[PDB]
Structure 1
Amino acid sequence: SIQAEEWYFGKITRRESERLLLNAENPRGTFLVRESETTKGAYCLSVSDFDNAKGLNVKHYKIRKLDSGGFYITSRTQFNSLQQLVAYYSKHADGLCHRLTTVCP
Protein backbone atom coordinates (compact mmCIF):
# COMPACT_ATOMS: atom_id res chain seq x y z
CA SER A 1 0.00 0.00 0.00
CA ILE A 2 1.83 3.04 -1.11
CA GLN A 3 0.20 5.17 1.66
CA ALA A 4 2.51 3.60 4.19
CA GLU A 5 5.74 3.95 2.15
CA GLU A 6 8.62 5.89 3.72
CA TRP A 7 9.33 7.82 0.61
CA TYR A 8 5.69 8.54 -0.31
CA PHE A 9 4.26 11.89 0.88
CA GLY A 10 0.66 11.92 -0.49
CA LYS A 11 -0.98 15.27 -1.22
CA ILE A 12 1.65 17.62 0.20
CA THR A 13 1.97 20.78 -1.86
CA ARG A 14 4.78 21.69 -4.15
CA ARG A 15 5.77 24.34 -1.64
CA GLU A 16 5.74 21.97 1.35
CA SER A 17 7.97 19.35 -0.44
CA GLU A 18 10.49 22.12 -1.09
CA ARG A 19 10.20 23.23 2.54
CA LEU A 20 11.00 19.61 3.50
CA LEU A 21 13.94 19.11 1.13
CA LEU A 22 15.90 22.42 1.26
CA ASN A 23 17.60 21.79 4.47
CA ALA A 24 21.22 21.64 5.35
CA GLU A 25 20.70 18.12 6.77
CA ASN A 26 19.74 16.62 3.43
CA PRO A 27 22.31 15.11 0.98
CA ARG A 28 22.11 15.92 -2.69
CA GLY A 29 19.66 13.21 -3.83
CA THR A 30 17.31 13.41 -0.82
CA PHE A 31 13.85 12.75 -2.41
CA LEU A 32 10.16 12.11 -2.04
CA VAL A 33 7.23 11.08 -4.35
CA ARG A 34 3.87 12.82 -4.05
CA GLU A 35 0.80 13.58 -6.07
CA SER A 36 1.11 16.38 -8.58
CA GLU A 37 -1.28 19.24 -7.54
CA THR A 38 -1.28 20.60 -11.11
CA THR A 39 -1.93 17.35 -13.11
CA LYS A 40 -4.44 14.97 -11.56
CA GLY A 41 -3.53 11.47 -12.02
CA ALA A 42 0.22 12.26 -12.20
CA TYR A 43 2.78 11.88 -9.45
CA CYS A 44 5.94 13.85 -8.93
CA LEU A 45 9.47 13.00 -7.75
CA SER A 46 11.02 15.91 -5.87
CA VAL A 47 14.85 15.71 -5.46
CA SER A 48 17.21 18.06 -3.57
CA ASP A 49 20.26 19.31 -5.38
CA PHE A 50 23.04 21.71 -4.81
CA ASP A 51 24.74 23.84 -7.44
CA ASN A 52 27.44 26.40 -6.45
CA ALA A 53 25.52 29.37 -7.87
CA LYS A 54 22.05 28.91 -6.46
CA GLY A 55 22.96 26.69 -3.41
CA LEU A 56 20.38 24.21 -2.33
CA ASN A 57 17.57 23.88 -4.90
CA VAL A 58 14.82 21.27 -5.65
CA LYS A 59 14.08 19.84 -9.14
CA HIS A 60 10.60 18.22 -9.65
CA TYR A 61 10.09 15.51 -12.24
CA LYS A 62 6.53 14.56 -13.21
CA ILE A 63 5.76 10.73 -13.12
CA ARG A 64 3.10 9.71 -15.63
CA LYS A 65 0.99 6.56 -15.27
CA LEU A 66 0.47 4.41 -18.35
CA ASP A 67 -3.21 3.42 -18.54
CA SER A 68 -1.92 -0.10 -19.08
CA GLY A 69 -0.32 -0.15 -15.61
CA GLY A 70 3.26 1.15 -15.46
CA PHE A 71 4.95 4.41 -14.57
CA TYR A 72 7.50 6.55 -16.44
CA ILE A 73 9.67 9.65 -16.17
CA THR A 74 11.47 9.16 -19.70
CA SER A 75 11.09 6.98 -22.86
CA ARG A 76 14.21 5.07 -21.91
CA THR A 77 12.61 2.76 -19.35
CA GLN A 78 9.16 2.34 -17.91
CA PHE A 79 8.30 0.51 -14.57
CA ASN A 80 5.45 -1.59 -13.21
CA SER A 81 5.37 0.23 -9.84
CA LEU A 82 6.55 3.38 -8.12
CA GLN A 83 8.71 1.14 -5.83
CA GLN A 84 10.50 -0.22 -8.92
CA LEU A 85 10.93 3.32 -10.30
CA VAL A 86 12.37 4.48 -6.90
CA ALA A 87 14.84 1.60 -7.06
CA TYR A 88 16.02 2.15 -10.59
CA TYR A 89 16.88 5.80 -10.00
CA SER A 90 18.51 4.92 -6.72
CA LYS A 91 21.01 3.06 -8.88
CA HIS A 92 21.22 5.30 -11.94
CA ALA A 93 20.42 9.00 -12.39
CA ASP A 94 19.68 8.51 -16.15
CA GLY A 95 19.04 12.15 -16.91
CA LEU A 96 17.85 13.08 -13.33
CA CYS A 97 19.89 15.78 -11.59
CA HIS A 98 21.24 13.23 -9.07
CA ARG A 99 20.80 9.59 -8.08
CA LEU A 100 18.20 9.19 -5.38
CA THR A 101 20.40 8.74 -2.30
CA THR A 102 18.32 9.55 0.85
CA VAL A 103 14.48 9.24 1.56
CA CYS A 104 13.26 12.64 2.77
CA PRO A 105 12.84 12.44 6.61
Structure 2
Amino acid sequence: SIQAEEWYFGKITRRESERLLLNAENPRGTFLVRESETTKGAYCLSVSDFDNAKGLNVKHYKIRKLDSGGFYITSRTQFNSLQQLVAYYSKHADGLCHRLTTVCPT
Protein backbone atom coordinates (compact mmCIF):
# COMPACT_ATOMS: atom_id res chain seq x y z
CA SER A 1 0.00 0.00 0.00
CA ILE A 2 1.82 3.05 -1.31
CA GLN A 3 -0.78 5.18 0.49
CA ALA A 4 0.83 4.05 3.72
CA GLU A 5 4.17 5.51 2.58
CA GLU A 6 5.13 8.82 4.13
CA TRP A 7 6.60 10.04 0.78
CA TYR A 8 3.25 9.32 -0.91
CA PHE A 9 1.38 12.61 -1.16
CA GLY A 10 -1.40 11.15 -3.25
CA LYS A 11 -3.65 13.60 -4.94
CA ILE A 12 -1.77 16.86 -4.86
CA THR A 13 -1.20 19.10 -7.95
CA ARG A 14 2.12 19.72 -9.69
CA ARG A 15 2.05 23.35 -8.44
CA GLU A 16 1.46 22.20 -4.86
CA SER A 17 4.37 19.75 -5.15
CA GLU A 18 6.52 22.65 -6.34
CA ARG A 19 5.39 24.91 -3.52
CA LEU A 20 6.41 22.21 -1.02
CA LEU A 21 9.71 21.39 -2.72
CA LEU A 22 10.82 24.96 -3.34
CA ASN A 23 11.63 25.54 0.30
CA ALA A 24 15.15 26.96 0.88
CA GLU A 25 15.70 24.41 3.63
CA ASN A 26 15.31 21.51 1.20
CA PRO A 27 18.58 19.87 0.11
CA ARG A 28 19.00 18.31 -3.37
CA GLY A 29 16.98 15.12 -3.76
CA THR A 30 14.12 16.13 -1.45
CA PHE A 31 11.15 14.27 -2.95
CA LEU A 32 7.57 13.04 -2.97
CA VAL A 33 5.41 10.77 -5.10
CA ARG A 34 1.99 11.94 -6.18
CA GLU A 35 -0.68 11.07 -8.73
CA SER A 36 -0.13 12.50 -12.19
CA GLU A 37 -2.61 15.33 -12.98
CA THR A 38 -3.39 13.99 -16.44
CA THR A 39 -1.53 10.70 -17.10
CA LYS A 40 -3.94 8.01 -15.93
CA GLY A 41 -2.47 5.18 -13.89
CA ALA A 42 0.92 6.86 -13.71
CA TYR A 43 2.42 8.58 -10.68
CA CYS A 44 4.79 11.52 -10.57
CA LEU A 45 8.06 11.54 -8.64
CA SER A 46 8.70 15.24 -7.87
CA VAL A 47 12.30 16.02 -6.89
CA SER A 48 14.17 19.14 -5.73
CA ASP A 49 17.52 20.05 -7.27
CA PHE A 50 19.92 22.93 -6.82
CA ASP A 51 22.73 24.52 -8.78
CA ASN A 52 24.36 27.96 -9.12
CA ALA A 53 22.86 28.34 -12.63
CA LYS A 54 19.22 27.60 -11.78
CA GLY A 55 19.35 27.80 -7.99
CA LEU A 56 16.63 25.72 -6.24
CA ASN A 57 14.30 24.08 -8.76
CA VAL A 58 11.97 21.05 -9.22
CA LYS A 59 11.89 18.14 -11.70
CA HIS A 60 8.98 15.75 -12.31
CA TYR A 61 9.38 12.22 -13.59
CA LYS A 62 6.60 9.86 -14.53
CA ILE A 63 6.38 6.47 -12.83
CA ARG A 64 4.65 3.91 -15.01
CA LYS A 65 2.88 0.86 -13.55
CA LEU A 66 2.06 -2.17 -15.68
CA ASP A 67 -0.88 -4.49 -14.97
CA SER A 68 1.97 -6.94 -15.65
CA GLY A 69 3.27 -5.73 -12.27
CA GLY A 70 6.42 -3.72 -12.55
CA PHE A 71 6.99 -0.07 -11.76
CA TYR A 72 9.48 2.08 -13.69
CA ILE A 73 10.52 5.53 -14.95
CA THR A 74 12.51 3.85 -17.78
CA SER A 75 11.25 0.46 -19.09
CA ARG A 76 14.86 -0.83 -19.03
CA THR A 77 14.87 -0.53 -15.22
CA GLN A 78 11.83 -2.04 -13.51
CA PHE A 79 10.83 -2.89 -9.93
CA ASN A 80 8.36 -5.20 -8.18
CA SER A 81 7.03 -2.30 -6.10
CA LEU A 82 7.06 1.50 -5.85
CA GLN A 83 8.90 1.16 -2.55
CA GLN A 84 11.65 -0.84 -4.28
CA LEU A 85 11.82 1.86 -6.98
CA VAL A 86 12.17 4.62 -4.39
CA ALA A 87 14.89 2.63 -2.62
CA TYR A 88 16.82 2.15 -5.88
CA TYR A 89 16.72 5.84 -6.75
CA SER A 90 17.87 6.78 -3.24
CA LYS A 91 21.11 5.02 -4.14
CA HIS A 92 21.46 5.83 -7.84
CA ALA A 93 20.95 9.15 -9.62
CA ASP A 94 21.02 7.45 -13.03
CA GLY A 95 19.06 9.85 -15.26
CA LEU A 96 17.41 11.81 -12.41
CA CYS A 97 18.47 15.31 -11.35
CA HIS A 98 19.76 13.82 -8.06
CA ARG A 99 19.38 10.60 -6.05
CA LEU A 100 16.39 10.65 -3.65
CA THR A 101 17.57 11.92 -0.23
CA THR A 102 14.88 13.26 2.05
CA VAL A 103 11.10 13.01 2.19
CA CYS A 104 9.52 16.41 1.50
CA PRO A 105 8.24 18.03 4.68
CA THR A 106 4.68 19.42 4.60
TM-score, structure 2 as length reference: 0.95
Partner of 2:5: 5
- For 1:27-73, what per-residue CA distance to the aligned partner results, in whole angstroms no more than 9, with x for missing partners? 10000001001111110100000121221110000001112011110
Aligned residue pairs, count = 105
Cα offset, 1:75, TM superposition: 3.1
Partner of 1:44: 44
- Partner Cα distance (2:97, 2:76) in 1: 16
Cα offset, 1:4, TM superposition: 2.1
Q: Report which of the two has the higher share of strand.
A: 2
Cα RMSD after superposing both structures: 0.9
- Partner Cα distance (2:75, 2:82) in 1: 16
Which segments of 5 or more consecutive residues in structure 2 lack a partner in the other structure? none
- After TM superposition, the runs of 4+ consecutive aligned structure 1 residues lying more than 2 A away are none
Cα offset, 1:76, TM superposition: 3.0
- For 1:59-102, what per-residue CA distance to the aligned partner results, in whole angstroms no more than 9, with x for missing partners? 00000111201111013310011100000000111111100011
- Partner Cα distance (2:103, 2:22) in 1: 13
- Partner Cα distance (2:91, 2:54) in 1: 26
- Partner Cα distance (2:49, 2:85) in 1: 19
- Partner Cα distance (2:102, 2:29) in 1: 6
Cα offset, 1:6, TM superposition: 0.7
What is the SS of the residue equivalent to 1:9?
strand
- Partner Cα distance (1:76, 1:22) in 2: 30
